[PDB]
Amino acid sequence: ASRAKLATNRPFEIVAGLPASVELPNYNSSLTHPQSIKNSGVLYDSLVSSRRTWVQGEMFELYWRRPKKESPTSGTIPLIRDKMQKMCDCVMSGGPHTFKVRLFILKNDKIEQKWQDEQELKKKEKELKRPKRKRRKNAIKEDKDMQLTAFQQKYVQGAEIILEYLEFTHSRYYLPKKSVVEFLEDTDEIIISWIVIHNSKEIEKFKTKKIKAKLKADQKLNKEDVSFNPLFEADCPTPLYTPMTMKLSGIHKRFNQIIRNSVSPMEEVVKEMEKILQIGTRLSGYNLWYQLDGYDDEALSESLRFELNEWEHAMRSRRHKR
Amino acid sequence: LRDNIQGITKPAIRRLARRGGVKRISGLIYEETRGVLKVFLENVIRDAVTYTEHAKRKTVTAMDVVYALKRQGRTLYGFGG
DNA sequence: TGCACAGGATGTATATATCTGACACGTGCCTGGAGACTAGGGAGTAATCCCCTTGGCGGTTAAAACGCGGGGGACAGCGCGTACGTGCGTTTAAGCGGTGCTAGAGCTTGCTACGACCAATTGAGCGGCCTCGGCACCGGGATTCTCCAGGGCGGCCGCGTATAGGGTCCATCACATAAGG
DNA sequence: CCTTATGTGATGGACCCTATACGCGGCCGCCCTGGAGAATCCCGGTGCCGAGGCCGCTCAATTGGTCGTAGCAAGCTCTAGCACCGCTTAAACGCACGTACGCGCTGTCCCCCGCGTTTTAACCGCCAAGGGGATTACTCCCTAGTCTCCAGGCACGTGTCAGATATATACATCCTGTGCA
């Protein structure tokens, strides 16, 4: 935000701190002394920003962050480790960028209790009704790869999935329940799509206000003698919204069932999305001007250069901390 | 009338200190400010009331206030002097 | 079928006017200047007696100055924890003008009683002078506080005895399963 | 389906070696012991010179009378203060998040105290005054305290002029049936 306030009438606007315009840049018409992309680095800045944002953005709801340091808070690390189960390593693409992930399950205790009750019922039903062969080891391996081991047999449906970045293990995010999931059997690729609202906090707070108003009205009526959906409500503020889509690759057959079971009934979210699409304000698509004039944009160029220098200076320490 | 020492509020002390150009304030300041104002008012009011009672009087006039302040050395202009 | 426009509807920045404050011009009364009387405080005059430098000088002394050691006081850094800064939603009562009372303030009285002014007496109070005991200085025995040395415990550190303990790497173990019939 | 006896695959554990407390001893914080000695306390014990007492006397505090107008007592009257109404905000308030500020502790180093040696400022006595300044009094005379008339110019108020507020208008910003392409 503290970036230099661009001089009036520049042929670009500063979007996310960088020079961009809605229309495709016409350098040849607009620039007399264009600095090279090497000189500008705008492309570099954009790429670093993109990757970092993908590491830290709002795409998935955050749920756990490593606490910024005989404090017992150390003892909670193994507890948080055990509250999730450990699962195998998978690749993700974010726009032009790609990332890698290991998978972790969030232990739904109701599924554990119901599994114990189901085993009780099945046992009671059964009681009421009443060298070594390596090929068998290969069969067991394949069965455990496409059928389910005990932890997978309990967590088939309603299991909870946590995402973590293998290049940034500090943050954990929820897999979107309000998402469309397609499992490509031929390519082993999974595409996830969801709509995201930039002022969602505004909508949630107005939703809370409406809930309070309805509760007050019900209390007033009671003094004499609910699937509240903010997106349906006529007084909901305009969502600034974006539709998003992402592809996963590298997930194995057994995990697909867990994932496929985990997401919400499709028609309901489809109708919700259609409402969002009527009421939403779509994010406008714009084009970055990677080339800047060395004379009119000298301040902007140097500012970008300085910020890049600081970013790189910090980035070395990140691995030096490992 | 009760608790009117509180009636000054914090925000009034805030605004007055803002006139004084203070960039940073502490919570304890308010109580001390109230005490100082209390003793100042007590002295000024006692002087004014004795100035009034001399004249076989019942209404404290602006003359009594301004001359009481003059006796405290604090000189005030613009109220009919 | 859907568009162009003929006929019609709320509105409003532009424009014309009405609803409140302040300054200049008119009355009219407690005056400000002026005339003359007045005297006693101010100013001009003359001692007169007392206190202030002479003027640098030497021979001294008490205080000032200058030099030095050092050690601890100031002070720039900074880890960190929180309590004031900024930003909501929400409530109070501070502000606005309005209606009905009044009592305290303003001043005009009519004139009295106490204090301005005056001779005359006399004694309290001031001015001069004289004096012994209240004060000023410190000698003394005793008080008491300072400050390094350091006996001695033992916190902590040192050589190194022998010892108690943790993170680290190794694995043993259970659920329900693989196999024969 | 029954029915032996174990595969599957981690979290749970014993171990290696680490590093440590402390035997005997010292630096050090500290109790305290300890001395030397550098001050400070209180009591003479004394000889000096001022407090304060005593007397001479003079001028101003006190007195009895007179004159007159400043304070007092209504008491007439009128407007500024007081109180309750009751809408309208908006300034206060509770509460949430954070962040940059204040404090605790750090090491550093420079300057200002404790103290010793040198230098300067000051007084005593030389040598006894003359100058000129502040106090004191007499002697006009001029000055503005006084009563009084003259006639005003300054203050209290109303009228007039301007400004801030109010509201038509000449279209402004639009609605909407329907005839045209």
Question: Does the nearest atom of strand D lie within 7 Å of A252's Cβ?
Answer: no
User: Method of determination?
Assistant: cryo-EM
Tokens describing residue B80: 């009919």
How many angstroms separate the CA atoms of B53 and A144, rounded?
A: 104
- CB of A26 within 8 A of CB of A50? no
Stretch (H or E) spanning A207 = helix A200-224
How many angstroms separate the CA atoms of A8 and A13, rounded?
A: 10
Residues 6+ apart with CB under 8 A from A191: A181, A182, A184, A245, A246, A247, A248
DSSP state of A74: G
Q: Which residue stretches of B1-81 are H helix?
A: 4-7, 9-19, 29-54, 62-71
Q: Rounded to the nearest 5°, which phi and psi values hold at A167?
A: -90, 0
- CB of A62 within 8 A of CB of A80? no
Tokens describing residue A255: 């995990």
**Which nucleotide is closest to A151, CA to C1'?**
C175
Question: Does the nearest atom of strand D lie within 7 Å of B9's Cβ?
Answer: yes
Q: A244 CA to D117 C1', in Å?
A: 92
Number of other residues whose CB lies within 10 A of the CB of residue A251: 21
Which domains, ranges and CATH numbers included, belong to chain B?
Answer: 2-80 (1.10.20.10)
First to last CA, chain A: 31
Q: Return the nearest residue to C103, CA–C1'.
A: B58
**Which nucleotide is closest to B55, CA to C1'?**
C105
The resolution, in angstroms to one decimal, equals 4.4
**Which nucleotide is closest to A85, CA to C1'?**
D10
Q: B10 CA to D9 C1', in Å?
A: 68
Q: Nearest CA to A107 among A77, A129, A82?
A: A82
Question: Does the nearest atom of strand D lie within 7 Å of B25's Cβ?
Answer: no
Burial of A297 (0-12, 13-18, 19+ CB in 10 A): buried
- CB of A241 within 8 A of CB of A282? yes
